[PDB]
Design a protein around this ligand. Sequence first.
Ligand SMILES: Nc1ncnc2c1ncn2[C@H]1C[C@H](O)[C@@H](COP(=O)(O)O)O1
Ligand SMILES: Nc1ncnc2c1ncn2[C@H]1C[C@H](O)[C@@H](COP(=O)(O)O)O1
Ligand SMILES: Nc1ncnc2c1ncn2[C@H]1C[C@H](O)[C@@H](COP(=O)(O)O)O1
Lengths: 184, 122, 520, 520, 30
Amino acid sequence: WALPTYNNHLYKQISSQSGASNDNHYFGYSTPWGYFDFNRFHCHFSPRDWQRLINNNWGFRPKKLSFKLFNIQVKEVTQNDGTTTIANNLTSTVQVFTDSEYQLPYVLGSAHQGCLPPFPADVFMVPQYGYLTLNNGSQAVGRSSFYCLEYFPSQMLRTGNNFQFSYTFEDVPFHSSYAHSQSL
Amino acid sequence: QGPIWAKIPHTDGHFHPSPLMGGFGLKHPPPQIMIKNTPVPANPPTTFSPAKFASFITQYSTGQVSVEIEWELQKENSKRWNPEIQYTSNYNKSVNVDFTVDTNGVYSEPRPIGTRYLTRNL
Amino acid sequence: GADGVGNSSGNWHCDSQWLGDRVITTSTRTWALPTYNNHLYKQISSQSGASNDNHYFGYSTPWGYFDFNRFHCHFSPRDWQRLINNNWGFRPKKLSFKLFNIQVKEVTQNDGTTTIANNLTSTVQVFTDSEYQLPYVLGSAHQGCLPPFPADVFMVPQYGYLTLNNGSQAVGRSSFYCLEYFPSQMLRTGNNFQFSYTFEDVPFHSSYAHSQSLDRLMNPLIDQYLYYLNRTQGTTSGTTNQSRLLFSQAGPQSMSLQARNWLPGPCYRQQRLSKTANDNNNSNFPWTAASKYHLNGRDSLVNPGPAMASHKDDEEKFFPMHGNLIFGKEGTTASNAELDNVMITDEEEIRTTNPVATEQYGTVANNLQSSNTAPTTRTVNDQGALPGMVWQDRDVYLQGPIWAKIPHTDGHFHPSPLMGGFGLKHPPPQIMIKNTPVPANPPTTFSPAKFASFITQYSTGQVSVEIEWELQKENSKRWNPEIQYTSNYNKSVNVDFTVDTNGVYSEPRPIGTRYLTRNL
Amino acid sequence: GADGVGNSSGNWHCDSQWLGDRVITTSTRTWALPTYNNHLYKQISSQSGASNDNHYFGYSTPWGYFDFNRFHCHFSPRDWQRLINNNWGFRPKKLSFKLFNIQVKEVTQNDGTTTIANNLTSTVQVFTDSEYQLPYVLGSAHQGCLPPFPADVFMVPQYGYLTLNNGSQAVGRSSFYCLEYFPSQMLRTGNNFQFSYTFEDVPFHSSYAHSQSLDRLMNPLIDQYLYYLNRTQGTTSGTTNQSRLLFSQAGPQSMSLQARNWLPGPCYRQQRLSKTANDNNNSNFPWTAASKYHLNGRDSLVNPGPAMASHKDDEEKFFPMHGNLIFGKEGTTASNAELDNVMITDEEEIRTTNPVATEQYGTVANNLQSSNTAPTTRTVNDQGALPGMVWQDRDVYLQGPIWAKIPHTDGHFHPSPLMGGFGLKHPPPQIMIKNTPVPANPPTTFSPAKFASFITQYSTGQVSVEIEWELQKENSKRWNPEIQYTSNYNKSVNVDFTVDTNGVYSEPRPIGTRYLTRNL
Amino acid sequence: GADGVGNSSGNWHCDSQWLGDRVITTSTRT
Ligand SMILES: Nc1ncnc2c1ncn2[C@H]1C[C@H](O)[C@@H](COP(=O)(O)O)O1
Ligand SMILES: Nc1ncnc2c1ncn2[C@H]1C[C@H](O)[C@@H](COP(=O)(O)O)O1
Ligand SMILES: Nc1ncnc2c1ncn2[C@H]1C[C@H](O)[C@@H](COP(=O)(O)O)O1
């Protein structure tokens, strides 16, 4: 994965174009933060595997999860003349954390882009984080919420540091990997 | 290539909390993992300026990410006598191979793959 | 096992369940047994001058026998699909045989009506050739196996064997076998028969197809470090340039010239046939132009020969003259049936290890080329065995043979039954069965003459057969989906592998086994 | 193994010492690894109508791999001499593989000058195909092995494989393999890679030549007690003497008529070639007149065939049309190089067990001779396998292949790699290696498009390979000295197996293995 | 359960009685 510097390290207020559209009016914010997504099946199942699953099982479901970030490299670039040199910044850090209390607006499960490449050899760019609040047209209300991600405890990592995380899914019914041989 | 799960909105009421796009609806889904490069200030003035700091060193980050998921399976138990329909590739002499990279290395998924191939009774 | 009249001597066990590492199939059927040969051993032989390559000599016994050397005896279609689509291979392990719920019925033709009644005191005789002292008549694709469909009742086959013969006559070293000279268990109604068998170590079958080819085995990107000679004369063909010896280093380019490590399997060329009855020669050549062998001045048709592929790429219409196994559709004359009435088997998965049946084998030199002599090439149509050769064996089909006894000789080569399946030194033994003769009214005066007046009667009961199968699990890092067997989801007339309007089970197509792919 | 930047992750172990019963060779070399395919998996196939017997389909991976399937990777010339001149045979036993002292360099073309700098935080990925789930691309005599000379640095070969194909197109059963779908160890500078392997039971190689001949096996002094027929007509040819049946008892005199117990090995006649470019036919016949085979309607050249002798006595100039392995001298075009630029291998030690490659095999009868019919003789140019046949296998040379994976099929015959060496069901696994992709400057705006902007960089480090060899000791009661390999004591230009004026190592001649003699 | 020809393999249980908290119905038919 690769991660740029979004919003130029700035939190920016975003909203709808002054009279561009009505049913598309919205209000929210844009953060300098990226995020990881793997809410697609092809992130985990190779085609062949999907075939094994599909052709043999009445159903299935998730159980556990282990997340790991590692082999981190921070690169700083300079446009001196007409050529870009890229070099190592060894003393530079990166910040990670997980919304485990669900205090941040859940922006996943909306079929957005930026998930893990179906093909393992493919490198991907990490999506930028943005959220929507409550709005009256292009304007906002008083009960609108502003969320700063710097106000969350986060682990800072240098090169050679890493990030660990484990999660356990809840009791959720098996999916229907079957079709009824009878009719209502 | 579809969605897997979706957070169930924290409201007073739900009906059938299955995500409408399909998949698993969770009260408490896999949490969001935030990541960002820490700001690195560039050359500061020998004189003290209160103004917001805006001069930064441009830089990006790269690394690996790993994700391990355990899946519970519900096994097939049918007394159907005749063979059921299965997903399969075309044995036919073909151009490119399904779910593969091409002449200039670009992975491509030919068709959307369902899940309902085996048959159960009502 | 000994019980009463009004008490069943067994239950109906017809099921199958999987253990991920093995599968157990249990199969029960109802059987009926007549009185063969009228309780007589009869000498049989060939018609006085009817045919020559079909001359034979042997005997006919009053004994029946049980057969289940067909796969569909054990695997339902659905099961066969589970096996086929998931396993690198498989093999037999154990066996349990059971006869029970026996009923002996005697019939009488009084006037013009046949009454059938119970003979409770009548018996039946069973035994098993466990020392293999009787001629093994199984594994010859005969009929009389267990019905593919469990609901179908079947008739038990009669036992007969062949000996050594000189034409229609016999030799001095010919063997006569009496089955009454074997200890056998006699059963009344409420008695039953038990038997257990353990298969020997026999290699897993190939439930796979190679994803590579014997010739496409190397690295497409790198050149070899070995050199070959590719130019004998062709040079800078201008002035004073007759001939020269030039050598090229193997490249991905010279892909069929590179040094090799292995050979394809053996071959015995078959004649090529087309399904379109007009591509062929307007002659009748299924005998005069087909491949065959001869023992003791007797021509025998080499029906299924060594494992060779049926057709080359972009054809699929040309099948070897009997170079493969053929199954007859449900309801089809045993005598000259149409091509639309039979099912021919395609062996196109072994294209990568084996030569094509109809095509040549290769090219051999047969002269000493020089400036005086032009180099001669001879097409090889027949190839014995060679160090370095590798091959695959014939497939097995849902309705194909399972095993075959390996002949007790001084020598064998690759003891795999040519019709396919598992070759066993000591296969599941033969289970003989016959109704005990019941004499009719005897004379008040003593007659020495052979007794010939018997009460006509047949028997019926259930038979159960339980086999344990070891599975070889699939372990592939293939990224893309593999080809699987499946039914047509299309709106269809009748359902595949089913009974019809008037209750008749029918198998639509022959089912192979090689759907999953493994590398060489 | 985990250490720091300024601390080496291993040492230089390049040595060999003998234990009289075994020998341990250790070999270390420096290696360099580029970025193949630009970090991309590319589908490759044959040129749209370029060639037919060379049609192929497969893929190209960004992965490199390690190879040491050459003998000179382990044995210095001097060592090979010690082995060759003293041992009835030998074989592999154990193996230790090590990667270390890794350095990742990234390069930049700024203006017209390339600066190369350290990327300390960059990684590299290694793993081993120990379950043999990847197509085995070794044992095909490819290039990119470890340099014969320890001082030579080498480039690591790129990985590519071939699948199943119908012409330039592919089939449905074709397999795509992603190497990113394998668990692999990632290494930074100061990390290292460890691996150990144990060879299977594989027969000792023949480091000997038979001192007897299949036909000169009996007692020269005594006559047999068996009789043969040597006269059919020739009698006291005077009066009334047309024909008669006469039998002679075998004698040392009738030495090639005596009853025999064994046969020579199998054969597949090759075309005969002369090194003098004027004894040959003035035609270009390296393809139309050479021996070959065909799988799936695709002709493939039978380069090294069964082990057959290269020439008969008193010749040494006639070599089989590619009937043996050929090595290219140092510095010689991969395209049509002169005969004075290659090294051809003579297989003249197996003259005693094997037929000559260029000559016939023997003589077979093919008629029923009588007074009416004259007896016909047919020259056999191709011989399968026969009970009683014995043979020797191809030699191995200092720069030859060592082992080869035995294809996972239903059948094999004599699983010895045809190019020579040790055939293994489970050979030393493939060791994959590749530089981890390092993305360049990303856009401040989110782009879903495939990432294509990468930092160019290559890797370098050392590799070590330790193999243990079991020796079969010489036990001969031969009185007279045997032939040994030796260097020319003569005043010479350059020294054999050495670097030259401008530092370039060169191997003068191919070295066989059969110098010592054993009896049949 | 295994008996003989001239021996019934069961009896006629057709009754019902109440337990104030539950009721048991037994029913037999030919
Ligand atoms: N994806 C998913 N998640 C959770 N529950 C599901 C899902 N799909 C179906 N259901 C059913 C299962 C329970 O019987 C019911 C609980 O509703 P409640 O509103 O919780 O009482 O909803
Ligand atoms: N169906 C079957 N049964 C037994 N052996 C088989 C079969 N198919 C292949 N083979 C191989 C396995 C052994 O390596 C070899 C034994 O031959 P032998 O002649 O026993 O030394 O034959
Ligand atoms: N290089 C190599 N590897 C393995 N076996 C070899 C080799 N060379 C000769 N042989 C012989 C040794 C065994 O007797 C036989 C096993 O064949 P099988 O087909 O395994 O029953 O093959």
